[PDB]
Write an enzyme that holds these catalytic residues in place. Structure first.
Site, short mmCIF file in Angstrom:
data_model
loop_
_atom_site.label_atom_id
_atom_site.label_comp_id
_atom_site.label_asym_id
_atom_site.label_seq_id
_atom_site.Cartn_x
_atom_site.Cartn_y
_atom_site.Cartn_z
N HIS A 14 -4.57 -0.04 -6.75
CA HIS A 14 -3.57 -0.21 -7.72
C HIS A 14 -4.05 -0.67 -9.08
O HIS A 14 -3.73 -0.26 -10.14
CB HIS A 14 -2.50 -1.25 -6.97
CG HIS A 14 -1.85 -0.68 -5.96
ND1 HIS A 14 -0.52 -0.16 -5.81
CD2 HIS A 14 -2.31 -0.29 -4.64
CE1 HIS A 14 -0.29 0.41 -4.69
NE2 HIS A 14 -1.19 0.30 -4.10
N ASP A 113 4.39 -2.96 -10.59
CA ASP A 113 3.95 -2.08 -9.49
C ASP A 113 5.38 -2.13 -8.64
O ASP A 113 6.29 -2.75 -8.76
CB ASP A 113 2.87 -2.60 -8.70
CG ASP A 113 1.90 -1.39 -8.12
OD1 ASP A 113 2.48 -0.30 -7.94
OD2 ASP A 113 0.74 -1.42 -8.17
#
Ligand code: POG
Ligand code: UDP
EC number: 2.4.1.-
Length: 435
Positions: A14, A113
């Site tokens: 990520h 996110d």
């Protein structure tokens, strides 16, 4: 002058996707505050060229800390899986510090996110527009969302079948986790940003957009391009397209039985291989010889190389000697392999990986080693696919498709970010009026 704060989930994949997106925005004259825990910031900093330092600044988010859960563990990278509940809980407990960061830096936009529902809520409370950026692909999401709306209908647009091993794997707890994930997408202001490209997932992106009633904007693929000296010397001794890189990502530790099947498959194929073997942080009682079958490295000899802990994946995949990638099918690894034109032998493990492997198989750029009916990896499958794709190259169709996909991906430039920049500009102009 326009400032964006970016909050990735505490996983290395990520962080990596978020860093590549930050660089694209920096090239568009945005100033970026890149926010994560110190351990994650330390891991990702070597991947930011010094030229970006003025535009992209790192901001440390503090999670609750204790001797049992100290800051070096505030990442999924190498984390014992049993600490994942604690990590998620600790991250939710960083919301107050995150609010203080946003109040101090007053960024014009927040990119967050999909693992943090609290983040758009803090931003809304401070009147800061927030956009969700998903570092994964869309196929798995559309597949997961389709049964909610169409329980008695087959997923359209794909013939993919999820093996029973995954279909089988608290019900209310699973529903809440899904609701939190979908909220991050649904709460996004105007658009959802996705690390994907239309040639691979355009139909799925459009289907997701209809289901969520939200615009889905592709910004992918986001691929980073940079112990290597020793590895390169060994690869230099091999024939072209003769070696397979073996990797299961930064968040997964295959079991002894899984490693046994992979090892025997590699041995039977007679391929050259570089395999990264890892142990969870704190495990100083475990070793390569222990985790691998007895005599496997001695039988492999010059053909095999095991790298402990971490390898320069991109550099290895780009080497002329590399002909295949045995991968757990993490999205960043799949995108890198497609960019570099390396065929993927899929050994998916969990979460989105099975779907990613199915998409790779559907594209024709790779193959999937199928699990047996009891859900186990099969040494015979691994050996057979390596032999067909790398050792004997009987699957020329897969090699040709992988080269064509790489050519398409390499052909794309800064234009891939135009839609995101236009949407950001419109959102900021609308919010400027409202506030
Ligand atoms: O936010 C609410 C959520 C918590 O519950 C929504 C639920 C009603 O189902 C959503 C979907 C399946 O719509 C079907 C619904 C009956 O109607 C189907 C169609 C006729 O519109
Ligand atoms: O030994 C390793 C293993 C992984 N990676 C990098 O770690 C990231 C893994 O991301 P992915 O989404 O594939 O899987 P995850 O680790 O999230 O499961 C990718 O950028 C890989 O290139 C690497 O550089 N060296």
């Amino acid at each position: 002058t326009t400032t964006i704060l970016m909050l990735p989930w505490l996983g290395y994949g990520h962080l990596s996707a978020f860093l590549e997106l930050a660089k694209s925005l920096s090239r568009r004259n945005f100033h970026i505050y890149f926010c994560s825990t110190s351990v994650n910031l330390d891991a990702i900093k070597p991947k930011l060229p010094s030229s970006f330092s003025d535009s992209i600044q790192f901001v440390e988010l503090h999670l609750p800390s204790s001797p049992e859960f100290p800051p070096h563990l505030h990442t999924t990278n190498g984390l014992p899986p049993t600490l994942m509940p604690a990590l998620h809980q600790a991250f939710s407990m960083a919301a107050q510090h995150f609010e203080s960061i946003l109040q101090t830096l007053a960024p014009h936009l927040l990119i967050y996110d999909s693992l943090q529902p609290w983040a758009p809520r803090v931003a809304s409370s401070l009147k800061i527009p927030a956009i969700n950026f998903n570092t994964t692909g869309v196929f798995w999401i559309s597949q997961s969302l389709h049964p909610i709306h169409y329980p008695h209908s087959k997923f359209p647009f794909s013939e993919f079948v999820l093996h029973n091993h995954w279909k089988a794997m608290s019900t209310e707890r699973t529903r809440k986790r899904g609701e939190a994930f979908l909220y991050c997408l649904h709460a996004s202001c105007s658009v959802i940003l996705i690390n994907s490209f239309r040639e691979l997932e355009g139909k799925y992106m459009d289907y997701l957009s209809v289901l969520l009633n939200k615009k889905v904007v592709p910004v992918g693929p986001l691929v980073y391009e940079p112990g290597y000296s020793s590895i390169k010397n060994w690869l230099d001794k091999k024939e072209p397209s003769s070696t397979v890189f073996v990797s299961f990502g930064s968040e997964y530790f295959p079991s002894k039985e899984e490693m046994e099947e992979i090892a025997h498959g590699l041995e039977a194929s007679e391929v050259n291989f570089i395999w990264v073997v890892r142990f969870p942080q704190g495990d100083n009682t475990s070793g390569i010889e222990d985790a691998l079958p007895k005599g496997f490295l001695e039988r492999a000899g010059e053909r095999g190389m095991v790298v402990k802990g971490w390898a320069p994946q991109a550099k290895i995949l780009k080497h002329w000697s590399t002909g295949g990638f045995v991968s757990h099918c993490g999205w960043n690894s799949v995108m890198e392999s497609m960019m570099f034109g390396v065929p993927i032998i899929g050994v998916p493990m969990h979460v989105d990986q099975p779907f990613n492997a199915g998409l790779v198989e559907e594209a024709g750029v790779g193959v999937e080693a199928k699990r047996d009916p009891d859900g186990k990896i099969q040494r015979d499958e691994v050996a057979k696919l390596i032999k067909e794709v790398v050792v004997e190259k009987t699957r020329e169709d897969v090699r040709k498709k992988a080269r064509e996909m790489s050519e398409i991906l390499r052909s794309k430039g800064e234009e891939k970010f135009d839609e995101m920049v236009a949407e950001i500009s419109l959102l900021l102009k609308i919010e400027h009026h409202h506030h």
